[PDB]
Design a protein around this ligand. Structure first.
Ligand SMILES: [Br-]
Ligand SMILES: [Br-]
Ligand SMILES: [Br-]
Ligand SMILES: [Br-]
Ligand SMILES: [Br-]
Ligand SMILES: [Br-]
Ligand SMILES: [Br-]
Ligand SMILES: [Br-]
Ligand SMILES: [Br-]
Ligand SMILES: [Br-]
Ligand SMILES: [Br-]
Ligand SMILES: [Br-]
Ligand SMILES: [Br-]
Ligand SMILES: [Br-]
Ligand SMILES: [Br-]
Ligand SMILES: [Br-]
Ligand SMILES: [Br-]
Ligand SMILES: [Br-]
Ligand SMILES: [Br-]
Ligand SMILES: [Br-]
Ligand SMILES: [Br-]
Ligand SMILES: [Br-]
Ligand SMILES: [Br-]
Ligand SMILES: [Br-]
Ligand SMILES: [Br-]
Ligand SMILES: [Br-]
Ligand SMILES: [Br-]
Ligand SMILES: [Br-]
Ligand SMILES: [Br-]
Ligand SMILES: [Br-]
Ligand SMILES: [Br-]
Ligand SMILES: [Br-]
Ligand code: NA
Ligand SMILES: [Xe]
Length: 240
């Protein structure tokens, strides 16, 4: 997250860190949203590589013991069947991860609430992106979970020439684009939290930014729109 502020430890308890094994260590690569005690929602592109993945819930500082972490292996990966890694613009950038264990809930670990199916936010609805992604274009991961305020940019504007043109689909949410604040690499897979009738819901799964840079004016961060996938999510969870 570029132009973020440090999140309070208990503000976003459904946020997870998706990490891959690297030698005797683990490295953060993406975010995710805990949606059942044993299921995480993330981006399909995050699990394109066939690595060993683990999920950390109750994570705040990637570099220090927070005293609240639960470390759980990824047991099963169900990527959206229409996803194509060489066509992120087509959308379908969503995957579910079944965890090896069911995590224990507490003020640092809660389920993310999802929007009602087919819900579309009005232009300029306020949202926060959260993540440990790069804090500058071509920078480094954050140590502590960041949040940044990114208002939505509706399909008509986001798909206009000055913005993302044909790259953006109605199955995506655009948010941000002020040139200061944005998602960035390593935020992929994580949530876009937006208020609806007084409650935050996870409306977006971070999918991509401009090749030009993370915080680029009129290149808002682009998210998979969760409310286009409610039936898909329920179907996977029901069969698995
Ligand atoms: Br949350
Ligand atoms: Br390795
Ligand atoms: Br480690
Ligand atoms: Br890390
Ligand atoms: Br549950
Ligand atoms: Br469970
Ligand atoms: Br900290
Ligand atoms: Br560090
Ligand atoms: Br540590
Ligand atoms: Br495990
Ligand atoms: Br698998
Ligand atoms: Br799969
Ligand atoms: Br529990
Ligand atoms: Br609690
Ligand atoms: Br608390
Ligand atoms: Br909703
Ligand atoms: Br629904
Ligand atoms: Br829809
Ligand atoms: Br939306
Ligand atoms: Br930091
Ligand atoms: Br335009
Ligand atoms: Br396209
Ligand atoms: Br669409
Ligand atoms: Br759609
Ligand atoms: Br990424
Ligand atoms: Br990264
Ligand atoms: Br309201
Ligand atoms: Br509200
Ligand atoms: Br501009
Ligand atoms: Br749906
Ligand atoms: Br359903
Ligand atoms: Br269906
Ligand atoms: Na930590
Ligand atoms: Xe990203």
């Amino acid at each position: 997250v570029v132009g973020g502020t440090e999140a309070q430890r208990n503000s976003w308890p459904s946020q997870i860190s998706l990490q891959y094994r690297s030698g005797s260590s683990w490295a953060h690569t993406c975010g995710g949203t805990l949606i059942r005690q044993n299921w995480v929602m993330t981006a399909a592109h995050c699990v394109d590589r066939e690595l060993t993945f683990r999920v950390v819930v109750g994570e705040h500082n990637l570099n220090q013991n927070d005293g609240t972490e639960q470390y759980v292996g990824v047991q099963k990966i169900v990527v959206h069947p229409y996803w194509n890694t060489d066509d992120v613009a087509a959308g379908y950038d969503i995957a579910l991860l079944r965890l090896a264990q069911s995590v224990t809930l507490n003020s640092y670990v809660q389920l993310g609430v999802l929007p009602r199916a087919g819900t579309i936010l009005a232009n300029n609805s306020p949202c926060y992106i959260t993540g440990w992604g790069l804090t500058r274009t071509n920078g480094q991961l954050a140590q502590t979970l960041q949040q940044a305020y990114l208002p939505t940019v509706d399909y008509a504007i986001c798909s206009s020439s000055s913005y993302w043109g044909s790259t953006v689909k109605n199955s995506m949410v655009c948010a941000g684009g002020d040139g200061v604040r944005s998602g960035c690499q390593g935020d992929s897979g994580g949530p876009l939290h937006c208020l609806v009738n007084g409650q935050y819901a996870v409306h977006g799964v971070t999918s991509f930014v401009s090749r030009l840079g993370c915080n680029v004016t009129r290149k808002p961060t682009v998210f998979t729109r969760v409310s286009a996938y409610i039936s898909w999510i329920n179907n996977v969870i029901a069969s698995n």
